[PDB]
Amino acid sequence: MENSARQVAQDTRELHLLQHIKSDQSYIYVFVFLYYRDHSVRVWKLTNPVSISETLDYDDLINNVNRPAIYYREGITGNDAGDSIIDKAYCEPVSFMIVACGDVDIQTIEVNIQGYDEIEGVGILDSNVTPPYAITATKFERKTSGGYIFYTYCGLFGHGDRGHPTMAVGVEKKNRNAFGRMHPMYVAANYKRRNFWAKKDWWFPTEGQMVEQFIKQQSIPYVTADNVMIAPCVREIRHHAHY
Amino acid sequence: MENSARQVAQDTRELHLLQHIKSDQSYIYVFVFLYYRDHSVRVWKLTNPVSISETLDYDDLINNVNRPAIYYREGITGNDAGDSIIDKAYCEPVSFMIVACGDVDIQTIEVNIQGYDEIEGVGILDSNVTPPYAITATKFERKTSGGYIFYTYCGLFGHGDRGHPTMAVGVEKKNRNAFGRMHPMYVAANYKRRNFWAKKDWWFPTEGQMVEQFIKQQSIPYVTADNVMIAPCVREIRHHAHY
Amino acid sequence: MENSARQVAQDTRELHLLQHIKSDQSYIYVFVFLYYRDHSVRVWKLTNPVSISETLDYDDLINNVNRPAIYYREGITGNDAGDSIIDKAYCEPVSFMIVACGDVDIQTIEVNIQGYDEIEGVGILDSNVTPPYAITATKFERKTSGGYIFYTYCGLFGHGDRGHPTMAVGVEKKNRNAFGRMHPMYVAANYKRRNFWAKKDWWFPTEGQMVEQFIKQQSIPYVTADNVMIAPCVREIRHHAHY
Ligand SMILES: Nc1nc2c(ncn2[C@@H]2O[C@H](COP(=O)(O)OP(=O)(O)OP(=O)(O)O)[C@@H](O)[C@H]2O)c(=O)[nH]1
Ligand SMILES: Nc1nc2c(ncn2[C@@H]2O[C@H](COP(=O)(O)OP(=O)(O)OP(=O)(O)O)[C@@H](O)[C@H]2O)c(=O)[nH]1
Ligand SMILES: Nc1nc2c(ncn2[C@@H]2O[C@H](COP(=O)(O)OP(=O)(O)OP(=O)(O)O)[C@@H](O)[C@H]2O)c(=O)[nH]1
Ligand SMILES: [Mg+2]
Ligand SMILES: [Mg+2]
Ligand SMILES: [Mg+2]
């Protein structure tokens, strides 16, 4: 029964699943999960065939389901410039998790969290494009699920400037060989796909409900707050030893 | 009178119009028309000097003139996860037409319509960047108006997953020769123009009113519901036979 | 005291500030200031490590703090197609200033202001990608503040088509040598940063308040309405004569 052609069709499907990761036919993904004090989750999907580059602005990072604005916004724009009796908005996120999956090269990831104005450092002419805390690759945890590999990074936004967050996120698809996905003979085909797809969001009342209704349904790699991995698992198939 | 310099000035204008298509000085365009049950039309202009790449998200595809939301949105996010007494929103589009015009290379077009979550296939790790139905080039109809050529593709969204649509659209400007518009000596000049222009929309109470007030006024190639071509026409001018 | 190591640490900081402009580690910026009849200012930050490309649509250019819409919008979409008793919205901007700063190559800037439909010229097939008024480089004023250089361009929107404005803005970082920032060995690293950062806006009740709470606080080069330069100043340091 193990060598039945029907089983080999199943083997084909599973070899396809693992090889599809490395193939040019798959997308890379970064999912940004935002956890609020009401226990709800806002989720952003960032995705591209070869290159993810996105800003999540303040309005993308606050809870837009359990929600004049300028009175508060002016106070997070300039020091002591507010006219609000509310010091910190309830709907600012408590914590985040970044899940990088598909064929990401984690060594190329950047997660650059700033305050409301997006300006690193003391003034715009002194801002660095890559502050040290944006070089997050080595702080991701490498998770495995069978032959699948994904990466997680989680943290707290806090009660300071980054409690009114903006975030720039970018990552490249891993290229294990030398022909660049932006080499002149390829560039125009990938440039045509620079916005496949624009950032997309959803909201869920709790993490447990999101796991059942979205994480499992879309087979998105994930780790819950209690540190349980929720991910599809494709066991490795190979006819010969691997180094 | 036919060889009067004034007539030759007119000839210059019309030769200019046809040659401007192929020139680097013109834009390419994809117009996405969305037709609603109330007979109104929402229109997106997608445009670039050399490379169009855009996502139209759900909120871009529903009727935003003849209009809590999460009760419904949750039900199109996950299976059986809704809390809405409304099964299908009235403002979801009935049908679409894609008009590709200017110097598009129709062979490079992709029109990838997904459901609300934008995720092709059974799970994110198995999604294909190019599902077969996105390779729409050969399904466009080639329309001519004098020396102008444009392409149309129309269809129905339906009452299933794509009745809650998202769409990725991309196309390149035709290059009849070998120097790429993203070749190293050109790339930075076109990259600077990657967002010339961001997607732009309008709305019109009926197709007939849109034809008079917008299609004709902007000289946009178009085909009405009764299959009438509305397009400028520049008759070909040449001093010698053409193969 | 002038050669104390503490003073040399200060010299290092100031040499760093000037050299950081030319370094790949800094961003380029275009700030778009929009001045309304109520004396308030809406401000857009456009920024990238190497290449700025942005559209500011109509809704980005009107005053969104001191604020059915289609009755008016239809009248700026098509000629005589409106159904509004209001001929011109109060919240359309009176004037603009463009500040280009950081290591911009001003020779690569374009500021292309159109009316509401974004369509240059008489029809879409005749639109030019670069109308003459978009080639604004030589109309910028070159301002200096010590070793810092920045560029300003200001003007009026008016009471015609451009009184309902849209704008495309793009500029490249100056490259004083031959290795392109989009050369094949660099392109993928900068493409990953194409949306670092998406356009970001703020609003301020008056120019004077914005100067104290934002221009000074972020050390953004600026010129007030009375023609006063507000900018950080780093005096030049060099051990030898300069041509
Ligand atoms: N968690 C919390 N902090 C509050 C509350 N009310 C006031 N605060 C204070 O506001 C402070 C904001 O400044 P920080 O000390 O930087 O707080 P933080 O970002 O959590 O701390 P760091 O880890 O040092 O960055 C917090 O430390 C709290 O002490 C509250 O209701 N909850
Ligand atoms: N057109 C229409 N369909 C309705 C209505 N109410 C319920 N439905 C049903 O809802 C169904 C949704 O599933 P499908 O069978 O996939 O409909 P569809 O997308 O138009 O059909 P396909 O062409 O096969 O994709 C439709 O087929 C209708 O039978 C209605 O008011 N109008
Ligand atoms: N400034 C101003 N103009 C008004 C007002 N009411 C009507 N208008 C007129 O509306 C006209 C709009 O057309 P234009 O002549 O092109 O005005 P403009 O854009 O300022 O002038 P140009 O510099 O020639 O482009 C203005 O010239 C005014 O004469 C008003 O309250 N204020
Ligand atoms: Mg903190
Ligand atoms: Mg259907
Ligand atoms: Mg005018």
Round to whole Å and give the CA distance between C239 and C53: 38
Query: Residue A44, preceding bond cis, omega within 30 degrees?
Result: no
**Buried-state track C225-242, b at ≥16 Cβ within 10 A, e below 16:** eeeeebbbebeeeeeeee
B41 Cβ contact list (under 8 Å, min separation 6):
B33, B34, B35, B203, B204, B206, B207, B210
The C-alpha angle with vertex A126 and arms to A122 and A129, in degrees rounded to 5, equals 110
What sign does the dihedral B226-B231-B234-B236 (CA atoms) show? negative
Method: X-ray
Enclosing H/E stretch for A43 = strand A41-48
Report the DSSP beta bridge partners of residue A100.
Answer: A30, A151
Round to whole Å and give the CA distance between B169 and A209: 32
C80: left (phi over 0), alpha (psi -120 to 50) or beta: left
**Look-up of token digits 């298509």:** B21
Q: Three-class SS of residue A30?
A: strand
Closest CA to B197 of C203, C165, C99, C101: C165
| B163 within 8 A of B113, measured Cβ to Cβ | no
Ligand 3 neighbourhood includes C232 CB (under 6 angstroms): no
The C-alpha angle with vertex A84 and arms to A81 and A86, in degrees rounded to 5, equals 120
| C77 within 8 A of C83, measured Cβ to Cβ | no
Round to whole Å and give the CA distance between A161 and A35: 18
φ, ψ (nearest 5 deg) of residue C140: -70, 145
Parallel, antiparallel or unpaired: strands A95-101 and A28-35: antiparallel
**Look-up of token digits 């984690």:** A106
C239 Cβ contact list (under 8 Å, min separation 6):
none
A130: DSSP letter: S
Q: Which residue lies with its CA nearest to atom 30 of ligand 1?
A: A159
Which residue among C188, C209, C232 places its CB closest to the CB of A125? Answer: C232
Report the DSSP beta bridge partners of residue C167.
Answer: C56, C113
Report the DSSP beta bridge partners of residue C95.
Answer: C35, C156
| C44 within 8 A of C31, measured Cβ to Cβ | yes
**Residue B104: half-sphere exposure toward Cβ, Cα within 13 Å:** 31
Enclosing H/E stretch for A58 = helix A58-61
C124: left (phi over 0), alpha (psi -120 to 50) or beta: alpha
Question: Which residue type sits at C50?
Answer: V
Q: Three-class SS of residue C192?
A: coil
Round to whole Å and give the CA distance between B15 and B6: 14
Round to whole Å and give the CA distance between B148 and B196: 23
Q: How far is B67 from chain A (nearest CA, A)?
A: 19
* Pocket perturbation via mutation, ligand 3, pick of C159, C161, C162, C164 by most ligand atoms within 8 A of CB: C159
Using CA coordinates, name the residue in chain C closest to B197: C55
Ligand 3 neighbourhood includes C68 CB (under 6 angstroms): no
**Binding site members of A:** 157, 159-160, 162
Ligand 3 neighbourhood includes C87 CB (under 6 angstroms): no
φ, ψ (nearest 5 deg) of residue B53: -150, 115
A66 Cβ contact list (under 8 Å, min separation 6):
A36, A38, A40, A91
Using CA coordinates, name the residue in chain B closest to C182: B188
What sign does the dihedral C208-A126-B196-A50 (CA atoms) show? negative
Which atom of ligand 3 is the closest one to the Cα of C163?
19
The domain total for chain B is: 1
| A165 within 8 A of A93, measured Cβ to Cβ | yes
Residue C71 domain boundaries: 1-243
Q: How far is C193 from chain A (nearest CA, A)?
A: 6
| B41 within 8 A of B96, measured Cβ to Cβ | no
Report DSSP letters for C108-147, one per residue. G-EEEEE-TT---SSSGGG--SS-GGG--GGGSEEEEEBT
Question: For residue B146, what are its two tokens?
Answer: 């004098």
Q: Among the residues of chain C, which ranges form H helices?
A: 5-22, 58-61, 69-77, 187-191, 207-210
**Look-up of token digits 């929402």:** B42
Closest CA to A199 of A50, A60, A59, A58: A60
A185 Cβ contact list (under 8 Å, min separation 6):
none
**Residue B133: half-sphere exposure toward Cβ, Cα within 13 Å:** 9
Question: Which residue type sits at C9?
Answer: A
- Taking the C-alpha atoms of C14, C195, A95 and A138 in order, what is their torsion angle to the nearest 10 degrees? -70
Round to whole Å and give the CA distance between C112 and C128: 11
- Measured between alpha carbons, how far is residue C210 from residues A122, A161, C43, C238 in Å? 17, 20, 10, 35
- Measured between alpha carbons, how far is residue A36 from residues A93, A199, B84, C21, C44 in Å? 5, 20, 24, 39, 29
Closest CA to A231 of A143, A130, A110: A143
- Least distant ligand from the CA of A113: 4
| A109 within 8 A of A171, measured Cβ to Cβ | yes
Round to whole Å and give the CA distance between C215 and C213: 7
Question: Which residue type sits at B241?
Answer: A
Round to whole Å and give the CA distance between A163 and A89: 9
**Look-up of token digits 């009926």:** B206
User: Residue by residue, what is the 3-state secondary structure of A202-222?
Assistant: EEECCHHHHHHHHHCCCCCCE
Report DSSP letters for C81-117, one per residue. ----S-SS-TTS-SEEEEEEESSB-GGG-EEEEE-TT
In chain C, residues preceding a discontinuity (C to N beyond 2.5 A) are 67
Round to whole Å and give the CA distance between B166 and B34: 12
Q: How far is B79 from chain A (nearest CA, A)?
A: 7
Question: 65-104 in B: which are within 8 Å (CB) of A?
Answer: 68, 70, 73-74, 77-79, 81
| C81 within 8 A of C74, measured Cβ to Cβ | yes
Closest CA to C188 of B228, A50, B16: A50
The count of other CB atoms within 10 Å of the CB of residue B102 is: 26
Closest CA to A63 of A91, A40, A87: A91
Report DSSP letters for chain B, one per residue. -TT-HHHHHHHHHHHHHHHHHHSTTS-EEEEEEEE-TTS-EEEEEEEESSEEEEEE-HHHHS-SS---HHHHHHHHHSTT----S-SS-TTS-SEEEEEEESSB-GGG-EEEEE-TT---SSSGGG--SS-GGG--GGGSEEEEEBTEEEEEEEEE--SSGGGS-EEEEEEEB---SSS-TTSTTTHHHHHTTTTTT--EEEEES-HHHHIIIIITTTT--EE-TT--EE---B----SS---
**Residue A63: half-sphere exposure toward Cβ, Cα within 13 Å:** 21
- Measured between alpha carbons, how far is residue A164 from residues A31, A215, B8, C13 in Å? 20, 27, 64, 29
Closest CA to B148 of B49, B18, B238: B18
Closest CA to C56 of C167, C163, C157, C153: C167
Report the DSSP beta bridge partners of residue A114.
Answer: A166
| B148 within 8 A of B106, measured Cβ to Cβ | no
**Binding site members of A for GTP:** 157, 159-160, 162
Round to whole Å and give the CA distance between A75 and A159: 14
Round to whole Å and give the CA distance between B6 and C217: 61
From edge to edge, which strands make up the β-sheet containing A200-204? Answer: A141-145, A148-156, A95-101, A28-35, A41-48, A200-204
| B124 within 8 A of A101, measured Cβ to Cβ | yes
Round to whole Å and give the CA distance between A195 and C71: 32
Round to whole Å and give the CA distance between A206 and A212: 10
Q: Does the distance separating the beta carbons of C125 and B21 come in below 8 Å?
A: yes
What sign does the dihedral A181-A187-A193-A197 (CA atoms) show? positive
The C-alpha angle with vertex A147 and arms to A143 and A152, in degrees rounded to 5, equals 20
Round to whole Å and give the CA distance between C150 and C140: 9
Round to whole Å and give the CA distance between C217 and C143: 20
Q: Three-class SS of residue A57?
A: coil
A5 Cβ contact list (under 8 Å, min separation 6):
none
Enclosing H/E stretch for C31 = strand C28-35
Among A125, A127, A177, pick the best mutation site for testing chain C contact (most C Cβ within 10 A): A125
**Residue C92: half-sphere exposure toward Cβ, Cα within 13 Å:** 21
C18: DSSP letter: H
Q: Does the distance separating the beta carbons of B79 and A213 come in below 8 Å?
A: yes
**Look-up of token digits 């009026």:** C156
| C195 within 8 A of C201, measured Cβ to Cβ | no
